[model samples]
Target chain A: MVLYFIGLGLYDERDITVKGLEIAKKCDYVFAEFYTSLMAGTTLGRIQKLIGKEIRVLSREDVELNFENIVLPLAKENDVAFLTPGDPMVATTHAELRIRAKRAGVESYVIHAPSIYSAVGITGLHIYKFGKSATVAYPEGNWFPTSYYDVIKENAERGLHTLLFLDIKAEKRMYMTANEAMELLLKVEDMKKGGVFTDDTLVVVLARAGSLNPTIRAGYVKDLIREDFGDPPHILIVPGKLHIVEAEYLVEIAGAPREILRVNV
Target chain B: MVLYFIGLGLYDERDITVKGLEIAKKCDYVFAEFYTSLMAGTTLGRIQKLIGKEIRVLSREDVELNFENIVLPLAKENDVAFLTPGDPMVATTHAELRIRAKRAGVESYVIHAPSIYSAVGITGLHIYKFGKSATVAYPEGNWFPTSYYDVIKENAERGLHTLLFLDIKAEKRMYMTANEAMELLLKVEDMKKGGVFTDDTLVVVLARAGSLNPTIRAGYVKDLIREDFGDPPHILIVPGKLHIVEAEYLVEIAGAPREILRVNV
Candidate 1:
C-alpha cells in the first residue's frame, strides 16, 4: 500500500505523463486538488474518462489540513493517488505531505510533470538567468502583499530574470490575470517608489502555456498592459538585461518591440 | 506542415506527457538529441518503439550547424518532431532553433515535459526559493572555468538556493558525478578563496529523476562529496538557507542531517 503524488502538468488531462496516467489508472482511488493553480485546457470529466476512475476533488483545506485524515486512511490498504496541477511539490508545500505519510506508516513517491517554473523557458529567456520567484498576491482588507515587487527589484539589480506567479482564489474561480498582476505591480511601485515596475519596464506574459498557440507577448508594460492574452493561469515575467538572441526571440516569436534589439551590454 | 519541439521528460520513455507522445505518434518524422542531458532510464529503441517511428538521432554538430538542412527540410511539408531530454529549450540554446524554423517558413510549437529543473523539487526544497542556475563545467585544455562557483556565491549572498547542473560529455559517455563536482568546487574554493563551496556547505543531490526510485541525498558537502549517488545524470544543489519545513522534509525524506531542523530562517 502506497500513496503516489502525481502532477497533471500545465494545461490539460493529456498533459499528464504516460507514467502518471498509467499509475493513476491502476490506483484504487484518485484524488485531486486544483486550488494552487488552474488547468484551463481540460476538465475533471475528461481526466476521469481518460483514467477510468472517479476523481474525488479536494479543497485547499482538505489538502493542507486534512490530507492525512482523508487520503492516508485509504492508502493504508489500497494504492491512493493524489493528483495536482503542474509538477507536484514545486510551487505547493506538498513536500511536507511525504513526512506525514511516513508518520502514518504509508510510503509516498513523487512523479514529475511539466511545471511553469521550467516551462517559462519557452518565453525564450535563458533559464539559468532566472532568479528567485514570487507570487503576485491579491491584497485583501488591510493586507497589501507587495513582496513580489521587491523580488523583481532584487532580481533586476543582479541582472537575473524574475518569475512572477499570479495569485488565484480557485474556490471563487477568480484567477488573477496578467493585466491585474501588472496593475498590482504598478500600484506597488506608486506606493514604494522603487521604480522596479513602470510604464516602460519590459515584461513577458505567458497564458495557457501547455496549450498550442499559447499567447507569448513581450513588450513594455504600457504597451502590453491592455493586450488581450486570453484565458486564465497566466504567468508574468520581469526580465533583467537581455541577450541578443533572447531579444531577437522576443522580437520575432513573442512580438516584442524591435527597439529591444539594442542591448546595453 | 508543422514542427513540434517535444520533451522526452527526465529519465524514461514513459516520462513523456501523453500529449507529447500522442503528437509525436502522428508526426511524420522524429529527431532527438541527447548531448544536452542524458536519459538514464530508457533508450532510443524504447522511445522509438513507444512512438511507433524510426528515430533519427542527431549529433550536436548536426543540430547546431545543420538543423535547418537536416530537420527543417522535411518539416516544410511533413509534421516533424524535434525531441530533447527534459523540457526543450530550458537548459539548451535550442530556443534559437525555433527562430531558424520560423525563418525556414515552418511553424513550431513546444510540448512540455518533466525536466530535472523542476523534478529537483523532489529534493524537498521550495521551488520559489531557488535563484539563478549554473552548470559546473569540466575545465578544458587551458580553460579552468569557475563561473558556476561565482553563481553559487551570488545566489547564496541573496539567501537563495542555486541549482548546479553537472557537466556531461555524451559522446564520450562521460557524466560528471556529484562527487567530482564537489571536488571541483573545493578545488575552485582553494584557488579563489571565495569561501563559496567548502566541506561544511549544505548540498543536495538528485540522481535519475522521473524514475520511481531515484536517489535523493542531502547533507554537508563533506558527508556527500564521497557518497555514491548511483548511475549517470546527477544534479547537485547548493542551498543558501533552509526553512523549518524544508529542513524537516530533507531530514525525513532526503536523509539530510537532522541538525538542519533548527533552521536559521
Candidate 2:
C-alpha cells in the first residue's frame, strides 16, 4: 500500500503530467482539494472524465482535520492518490500532513507539476529576481491584513520583485482579482503611509497563466486598475527594478508603456 | 504559422504534461535544448519514442544565435515546438528569444510544465519563504564568480531561503554534485572570510527532484559535504530560519538532526 501526492498542473485537466495521469488511472482511489487555489480554465467533471475516475473532492476542513482518519486509513489498505492544484507540497500545511502520514506508518511519494510559482516566468521577469512571496487576503470585518503590503515593501527595498497570490474563496466561487488586490494595497498604503504603492507604481497582472493565450498586462497601477484583464485567478507582481532586456520584453510583449523602458530599466 | 515553447518537465520523459505531449506529437518539427539543466531519469531516445517525433537537439549556440535562423524559419511555414527541461521561460535568455520571435513576425506561446523552482516544495520548506535564487558554477582558470555567495548572504539576512542551482556541463556530461557546491562555497568562505557559508552552516540538499525517491537531506555542511546523495541534478538550499512545523518535517522526513528543532526553530 502506498500514498501518492500528485499535482494537477495549472489551468486545466489536460495539464496533468503523463506520469500523474497514468498513475492516477491505476490507483484505487483519487482525492482532490482545490481550496489552495482555483483552476479557472476547467471543471471537476472534466478532470474526472480525463482521468476516468470518480474523484472524491475534499474540503479544506476535511483535509485539515480528517485527513489522517479519512485518507490515511484508506491508504493503509489500498493505493491512494491525493491531488492538488500546482505542486502538492507548496503549501506548508501539506508538509505537516506528510509528517502525519509518516507517524501513521504510511509512505507518501510526490509527483511534481507546473505551478504558478514557476509559471510566473512566462511574464518575462527573471525568476531569480523574485523575492519572498505573500498573498493578499480579503479583509473580513475588523481584521485587516497588511502583512502582504509590508512584504512587497521589504522586497522592493532590496530591488527584488514580489509575487502576490490573490486570495480565493473556492466554495463561495470568489477569487480576488488583480484590481481588487491593487485597491487593497492602495488602502494599505494610505494607512501605513510607507509610500510603497502609489498611482505611478508599476505593476504586472497575469490572468489564466497556464493557458496558451493568457492575458499578460504590465503598466502603472493607475492604468491597469481599470483595464480589463479577463477572468478570475489573477496574480499581481510588484517589480522593484527592471533589467534592460526585461524592460524590452515588457514593452514589446506585454504592451507596457515605452516610458517604462527608460524609467524602470 | 507559430512556435510553441513547451516544457518537458523535470527528471524523465514521462514528466511532460499530457497537454505538452499532445501538442508535441502534432508539431511539424520538434526541437529541444538540454544545456540549461539535465533530465537524469530518462534518455533522449525514450523522449523521442514517447512523442513519436524525431527531436532535433540544439546546442546552446544553436538556440542563442541561430534560433531565429533555424527554428523560427520553420515556424513561419509550419507549427514547431521548442522544448526545454523545465518551464520554458525560467531561463532569462528565453525571454529574449521570445522577443526575437516577435521581431521575426512569428507568434509564440508557452506551455507550462514542472520546474525545480517549485519542485523544492517537496523538501518540506514553504515555497513562499524562498527568496532570489542563484546558481553555483565550476571555477575555471581565474574567472571565479562569487555573486552566488553574496545572494545567499542577502537572503539569509532577510530570513529568506535561497535556492542554489548547481552547475551542469551537458556536452562534457558533468553535473555538479551537492558536495562540490558545498566545497566551492567553503572555499569562497575562506577567501571572503565573510562567515556566510562556514562548515557548520545548516544546508539542505535535493537531488533528482522529479523522481519518486528524491534524496532530501538537511544538516550542517560538515556532515553533508562528503556524503554521497546519489546521481546528478542536485540543488542546495541555505535556509535562513525554520518554523517549528518545517523543522519537524525535516527531522521526520529528510533525516535532519532533531536538535535543529530547538536551535533553528
Candidate 3:
C-alpha cells in the first residue's frame, strides 16, 4: 500500500503538476483537506468536477482524528492520495500523516506544489528577510493576541519583512477581510502598548493572491483599515525598514507615495 | 506598464499556478533568472518551452547591470514577466529590480511559487520552530564564514531549527553535496571553538525536496560527513529540540538510529 501527500498549489485544478495529476489518476482513493488554505475561485465540488476525480473531502477534525480509522485502511488496501489546498505539506497535519504512513509500513511519497511561504517574494520583499509568518484571525473575544505583534517586532528588529496570512473559512463562507484584519491589528497594537503597528507603518495588502484580478496595494496600516481590499483570502505584509530597493519599488511600481514611506534613518 | 516577478516554484513546469501562468502569457517579454537558486529535474530551456513563450535568459550580472534596461523598458511598452527559480524576490537583486522597475514608473505584480522554504515541512519539523534561515556557501578561505555560525548559535539559543540551503552552480555542474556540506559544518564546529555543532549533535539532511524522491536522513554531523547523500540542492536542518512525535518520526522514517539523538538530562 502507498499513501501520497500531494500539494495542489493555489487555485484551480490545473495548479497541480502533470506528475501529481497522474498520481491522482492512479490512486484508488483521493481525499483533500481544505482547512490549511484555499484557492479563492474554486470549491471542493468545483475542483472535483474539473479534475473528474471524486475527492473525499476531509475537514481539519478528520485528519486530526485517528486518521487510520478515517482514511488509512482504504490507503492500506490501495494507493491513496491525500490532497490539500496550497502546498500540502506546509500544514502540520500533513507531516503527521507522513509519519503515520511510515509507522504503518505503507510506502509513501510527497507530491509538492506552490505554497504562500515562498509567495512572500511576490510582494517584492526579500524572501530571506521574512521572519516567521503568522495568521491574523478574527478576535475571539474582546481580547486580541499580541503574538503577531511579537512576530512583527521580531522581524522589524532583524530588518526582515513579516508575511501575515489572513485567516479564511471557505466552507462556512466566513472569511476575514483585510480591512477587518487591520482593525484587529489596531486592537492588538493598542493592547500590546506597542505602537509598532501604527498608521505610519507601511503595509502591502495582497487580495486574492493568485487570482487574475488580484489587487496588491501599498500604504499605511491605518489607511488600510478604512480601505476595502476586496474578496476573501487576503495576505498582508508589513515592511521592515525598506531595503532601499524595496522602498523605491513601492514608490515607483506599487503607486506608494514617497512621503508615506517610514525609512529606517 | 507592469513588471510581474513570478516564482517558478520547485520541480517542473506545471508547478506554476494559473495566476502566474496567466501573467506570463499576457506579458510581452518573459525572463527567467536562476542564478541564486537552481531547480533540479528541469532545465531553463524546458521551462521556456513549457510556458509556451520565448523567455530571455538573464545572469546575475544582467539583472545587476540593467534590470530596468530589460524589465522596465519592456514593461513601459508592455507587460513583462520576470521568472526566477524558487522564489524570485528572495534574492537582494530581485528586491533591487523591483525597486528599479518602480522607480522607472513601471507597475509590477508578483506571482507566488512553492520553494524550499516550505519543503522543510516534509521533515516533520514545525516551520514556526525555525529561526531566520541561513545558507552555507563554499568556503571563503581556510575557514568558512562565521556569520552562518552566528545564525546557528542564535537558532540554538532560541531552540529553533536552522535550515541551511546548500550552494550550487548549475552551469558548472557544481553543487555542494550533503557530505561536503557536513564537512563544511564540521569545520564550522571546529572553528567556532566547539561545544556547539558537536559531532554528536543531530543534523537532518534533505536531498531533492519537492520531488517524489525527496530524501531525509538524520544522523550525527560527523557521521553524515561520511554518508553519501547523493546529489546537489540539498538542505541541512539543525533542530534545537524535537517533540516526542518528531523524535519518533526521525527514528522510524528518516533512518535516525536511536543511539544518535541525545538530550542533556
Candidate 4:
C-alpha cells in the first residue's frame, strides 16, 4: 500500500509523463486537486478517460485540511494517487503534505513532470539567469501585496531575471493575466516610487507555455501592457540586463523591438 | 512539416510525457542526442521500443555541426522529432539549433518535460527561493573554473538558494558526483577563503531524480562530502537561510541535521 504524488504537467491531459500515466492507471483510487494550478487545455473527463480511472476532485480545503483523513486512509490498504498540475512538491503546501503522510505512517513517492519553472526556458532566456520567483496576487481589501515588486528589484540589482507567477483563483475560475500583473506593478511603482517598474522597462510575457504556438512577446512595458496575449495562465518575466544572444533570440524569435539589441544586450 | 524538440524527462524512457511520445511516434524520423545529459535508469532500446521508431542517435558534433543539414531537411516535408535528456531548449546549444531550424525554413516547436531544475523541488526546498544556477565542472589542466563558486556566493549574499549542476561527460560516461563537487568546492574555499563553503556549510544532494528510489540527502559538508549518492547525473544545492517549514522538511524528509532547524531556519 502506497501513495503516489504525480504531476499532470503544464497544459493538458497528454502532458502527463508515461511513468505517471502508467502508475495512475494501476492505482486503486485517483484523486486530484486543481486549486494550485489547472491545465488550460484539458478537462478532468479527458484525464480520467486517459488514465482509465474515475478521478475524485478535491478542493483546497479538502487537500490542505483533510488530505490525510481523506487520502491517506485509502492509501493504508490500496495504491492511491494524488495528481497535481505541475511537478508534485514544487509548492510548499505539497511538500508539507508529504510530511503529513510520514506522520500518518503512509509511504509516499513523487513522479516529476514538466513545470513552468523549466518550461520558461522556452522563452529563450538563459535559465541560470533567473532569480528567486514571486507570485503577483490580486489586491484585496486594505491589503495590497507588493512583495513581488521587491523581488524584481532585488533580482534586477544582481542582473538576474525575475519570474512572476500570476495569481489564479481556481474556485472562482478567475485567473490573473499578465496584463493585470503589469498594471499592478505600475501601480506599485507609483506608490513606492522605487523606479523598479516603469514604462520603458523591458519585459517578456509567455502565454500557454506547454502548448505549441504559445505566445512569446518581449518589449517595453508600456507597449505590451495593453496587447492581448490570449487566454489565461500567463507568466511575466522582468528580465535584468540581457546577454547578447538572449537579446538576439528575443528580437529574431519573439518579435522584440530591434532597439533592445543595443540597449538591453 | 514541422520540427518538434521533445524532452525525455529526467531519468528513464517512461519519463517522457505522453504528448511527447505521441508526437514522436507520428514523426517520420526521430533523432536523439545523449551528450548533454544521460538517463541513468534506462537505455536506448527501451526508448525506441516505447516509441516504436528507430531513433538515429546523434553525436554532439553531429548536432552542433550538421543539424540543419541532416535533421531540418527531413523536417521540411515531414514531422521530425529531436529528443534531448531534459526539457528541450534549456541547453543553449538547443536554443541555437532552433534558430538554425528557423533559418532553414523549418518551423520548430518545443515540447517540455521534467528537468532537474524542477525535479530539485523534491529536495523540499521552495522552488521560488532558488536563485541563479551554475554548473560545477571538473578542472582540466590550467583551465580551472571558479565562476560557480562566485555564483553560490552571490546567491547566498542575497539569501537565495543556489542549484549547482554537476558536470557530465556523456561520451566518456563520466559524471561528476556530489562528492567530487564538494571536494572541488573545498579546494576552492581554501584558496579564496570566502567562507562560502566549509565543513559546517549546509548542502543538499539529489541523485536519480525521476526514479522512485532516488536519493535526497542534506547535511554539513563534512558529513556529506564523502557520502555516496548513487549513480550518475547528481545535482548539489547550497542553501541560504532556510524558512522554519523548509528546515523542518529538510530535517524530516531529506535527513538533514536537526540542528539546522535552529541555526539555518
Candidate 5:
C-alpha cells in the first residue's frame, strides 16, 4: 500500500498542489497532523467538505506520542495520506513517521506546499538576513521562554531578522497575537540588556497572512503595542541592520516612520 | 489611483488570493517582477488566461533601477497592480518600491502570499534551530562568494539548519541546480580553513517545490557529489545539526541511503 504526505500550502483547502489533491482523492484513509498548523479560517467540517473526504485530524499527542498505532497501522491497510498544513515533510516528526512506515514496508510519497519561512521572504526582507527562527512558547504562570529572546537578540546583534513562529495549539485554536507578542518584546527592550529590539527598530507586524484580509503594519515596537492588528496568526519581524534599499522599503511599504529608519548620510 | 502589490502564491495561476484576483481584475495596469523567483513551470500567458487579465511583465533592472519611470509614473496614472511570483514583500527591494510610491503621493496596498521560511518550520525542525539564512551568487569569474559559506559554518556550529536561496535569474531562465550548488559548497568547504561542511554532512535537495513534479532528495554531501539531481530551480539544504527524527525523515522521505545518516544511540 502507498502512503502519501500532503502539504496543504498556506491558504484554505484549495491551496494544495495538484499532485497532493490527486493522491488525497484516492487514499483509503486520510489523517492530518493538526498540531503544526491549520489552514486559515477553515473548520474541519469545511475542509472535509471542500476536499470531499473524511480526514481524521490527529492531535499532537496522537502523532508525536502514539505514532505507531495512530499512523503506522493505518498505512498497512491501504493507501494512506498523512497531511500537514504546509509542506508535510518540513517537520522532523513527519520524516520519522516515514521511516517507521518504511520499516513496515509501507511506501510513501511527499506532496510539497508553500511554507511560512519562504513565504515570509515576500515581505521584501532579504531572505538571507534572518537568523535562527524561534517560537515564543507559552510560558505558564506568567513566565516566558528567554531562549527565543536570546536568539532574536543574537540575530539582532548581527543585523538579522528573527522569524518568530508564535506559540500555537492548532486543535485548541490558540494563536499568539502581535500586540501580546510586542508586549514581550517591549519587556525585553525595557530590560536594557542589548540593542536586539529597540524603540526605533522597525518591527513589521503581519496578521492573518495568506487570508483575504491579511494585515501587515510596520512601526516601532512600542507603537505597535498600542495599535490593533485585527486578526490571529500574527507575525512580528524585528529587523536589524538594513541595506540602503531595505531601509528605503521599510519606510515605503510597511509605513515605518521616517525618524526610525537609518538616514542615508 | 491606487497601486496594489499582489503575491501569486507558490505554483499555478489560481493560487492568487481572492484579494489579488479582485485587484488584478480591476487594475488598469498590471506589472509582474520575475527576477527574484520563477513560478513553478508556469508561463505568463497561462497566468494571464487563468487570472483573466492582461499582465505586463517587468525586468529586474526595469523595476529595481528604473523604479521611478517604470513603476511610479504608471502607478500615478492608473490603478496599478505589482505582481510577484511568490509573496511580494519577500524581496527588500519591493518594500523599498512601496515606500517610494507612497512618497510620490500614490496610495498603495499589498496582497500577501506564502513564504519559504514558514515552509521550513513545516519540516518539523525546531524552528529555533534554523540559524541566519544566506544565499549563493552565481560564481563570478574565479571568485565564489565564500561569505555564504561562513553563514552556514556559523549556524552549523550552533546546531542550526542552513537554508540556502540559490541564485536564479529567471529573465535569463537560469536556475542554480542543487548539484552545481553542492559543487560550490564543496569549494567553499575546501577554501575555508575551519569549515563546517564536510563530505559527511547531511544535505537535503528540493527541486521545483510548489510545482508539479517537485522532487526532494536527501543524502550526505559526498553522496550528492557523486549523484545527479535532475533539472534547475533546485534548493540545497545543508543541515548543521539534526534531530534523530529529522535524520530518519531525510533518509526515508528523501530516498536517502541508510549509511548516510548518523543514527543516535
Candidate 6:
C-alpha cells in the first residue's frame, strides 16, 4: 500500500509529468484538491481523461481535517494518489499529512513539479536574489492584512527582490488580480506612511505562467495599475535593485520602461 | 517556425511533462544541453527513446557563443526544441538567449518542469522562509569564493532559511557533495570568523531529490559531516530559527535529531 503525493504542474492536465501520470494510472484510487491554487488552463474533465481515472475531488475540509479518516483508509489496501496544483507541499502545509501517514503506518512519497516560486525566473529576475516571499491577502472583516507590506520593506532594505503571491478564493471562484494586490499595497502604505509602496514603484506581473503566451509586463505601479494582464492567477513581483542584465531583459523582453536601467540600477 | 525551450524535470526521462514530451515529439529538430545541472536519474539514450528524436548535445560555450548561429538560424524555418535539465531558465539564466531568438525573428516559449529550487520543500522546511539563495562553489587554486557564507549570515540574521546549492562542474562530471560544501563553509567561517558556521551548526542534506527515496537527513554538522547521503547531486541547507511545526516535521518526517524540537524551537 502506498500514497503518492503527486504534483499536477502549473496550467493544464498535460502539465502532469509522464511519471506522475503513470503513477496515477496504476493507482487504485485518485484524490485531488484545487483549493491551493487554480490550474488556469485545463479542466477537471481533461485531467481525468488524461489519467484515465475518476478523480475524487477533496474539499479543503476533507483533506485538512479528515485526511486520516478518509484517504488513509483506502491507502491501507490500495495505491492512492493525492494530487495538488503546482508542487505539492511547496505552498500548503500538507507535510503534516505526510507525518500523519507515518503515524498511521502508511508509506508516502512526494513527486516534485514546477511552481511559481521558480517560474518567477520567467520575469527575467535572478532566482538567487529573491528574498522572503509574502502573500497579498484581501482585507476581510475586522482584519486588514499588511504583513506582506512589511516583508517587502525588509527585503528591499537588504537589496533583495520580494515575490508577492496574490490571494485566491477557490470556493468563490475569485482570484485576486495583480492590480488588486497593488491597490491594497498602496492602501497599506497610505496608513503606515512607510514609503514602501508608492505610485512610482516598479513592479512586474506574470500571468498564467505555464501558458505559451502568458503576459509578462513591467512598469511603474501608476502606469500598470490599470493595465489588463488577460487572465486569472496573476503573480506580482517588486524587485529591490536591478542588475544591468536583469534590467536589460526586463526592458527588452518584458516591456519594462527604459528608465529602469537608469533609475532602479 | 517556433522555438521551444522545454525542461526535463529533476531525475529521469519520465520527469518531463506529458505536454513537453508531446511538443518534443512534434518538433522538427531536438537539441539539449546537460552541462547546466546533473540529471543523475536518466541518460540521453533513454530521453531520446522517450521523445523519439535525435538530440544534438551542446556545450556551454556552444550555447553562450553561437546560439544565434547554430540554433536560431534553424529555428527560422523549422520548429526546434532545446531541452535542459530542471525548469528551463530557472537556474541557467537563459533569458538572454531568448532575446537573441527574438532578434532573429524566432518566437520562443518556455515549458516549465520541476527544479531543485522548489524541490527543497521535501526537506521539511517552510518554503516561504527561504531567503536569498546561494550556491556553494568549489574554491579553485588561486581564487577562493566565500560570498555564499555571507548570504547564509544575512539570511540567518533575518530569521530566514538559507538554500545552499552545491556546485557542479558538468564538464568534468564533478558534483560537489554536501559534505564538501560543509567543509568549505567551515573553512570560510575559520577565515572570516563570522561565527556563522560551526561544528554544531544544524544543517539539512537533500540528495537525489525528485526520486522516490531521496535522502533527507538533518542534524548538527558534527554528526552529519561524514554521513553518507547515498549519491551525488546533493544540496545543503543551513536553516535559521525554526518554527515549532517546522521542527516537528524535520524530526518526524526527515529523521532529524529529536533535540531540534527543543533546541531549534
Cα lDDT of all candidates, in order? Answer: 0.92, 0.92, 0.73, 0.92, 0.71, 0.91
Model 4 lDDT per residue over A98-161, tens place: 8988988889999999999999898889999999999999999999999999999999998999
lDDT of 2 by residue, B109-151 (tens): 9999999999999888899999989999999999998899999
Q: Which runs in model 2 stand beyond 4 Å of their true positions? A: B263-265
Instruction: Tell me the DockQ of each model, to 2 decimals.
Output: 0.88, 0.86, 0.53, 0.85, 0.40, 0.83
Chain B structural similarity (TM-score) per candidate: 0.97, 0.98, 0.92, 0.98, 0.91, 0.98
DockQ of 1: 0.88
**Model 6: runs farther than 4 Å from truth?**
A263-265
> Residue A88, candidate 4: how far off, in angstroms?
1.6
Candidate 3 off by > 4 Å: A141-144, A260-262, B1-6, B18-30, B52-56, B70-82, B99-109, B140-144, B259-265
**How does model 4 score by TM-score?**
0.99
Better of 1 and 2 by lDDT: 1
What is candidate 4's TM-score for chain B alone?
0.98
Encode model 4's per-residue lDDT on B181-240: one tens digit a residue.
Answer: 999999999999999999999999999999998999999999999898888778999999
**How many steric clashes between backbone atoms does each model show?**
1, 0, 5, 0, 36, 0
Q: Between the candidate structures 1 and 5, which one is better when assessed by lDDT?
A: 1
Measured on C-alpha atoms, candidate 6 has an lDDT of 0.91
Q: Return the lDDT, model 2, position A97.
A: 85
* CA lDDT, candidate 1, residue A26: 98
TM-score of 3: 0.88
lDDT of 5 by residue, A1-265 (tens): 7788787766666556545666788888889877877676577787677567898988888888887787777787788888888666666456567666778887766666556666665456777788877777766797656677787877877777888877777767888888777777667656766766666556787676556456767677667777988867888787777766665565665566776554420
Q: How much is the lDDT of residue A113 in candidate 6?
A: 80
Q: lDDT of model 2 at residue B255?
A: 96
Kept native contacts, fraction for each prediction: 0.85, 0.85, 0.61, 0.83, 0.51, 0.78
Candidate 5, position A229, lDDT: 80
Model 6 residue B19 CA deviation (Å) reads 0.9
Residue-level lDDT tens digits of model 6 in B1-265: 7999999999999889888999999999999998888689989999999999999999998999999988998999999999999999886468788888888999999999998889999988888999999999888999999999999999999999999988988988889989889999999999999999999899999999888989999999999999999887899999999999889889998888899988887
In candidate 3, the residue pairs with backbone N, CA or C atoms under 3 Å apart (3 or more residues apart, or in different chains) clash, namely A114-B114, A127-B90, A249-B99, A252-B102, A253-B102
> Quick one: best DockQ, which candidate?
1
Q: Estimate each model's TM-score.
A: 0.99, 0.99, 0.88, 0.99, 0.83, 0.99
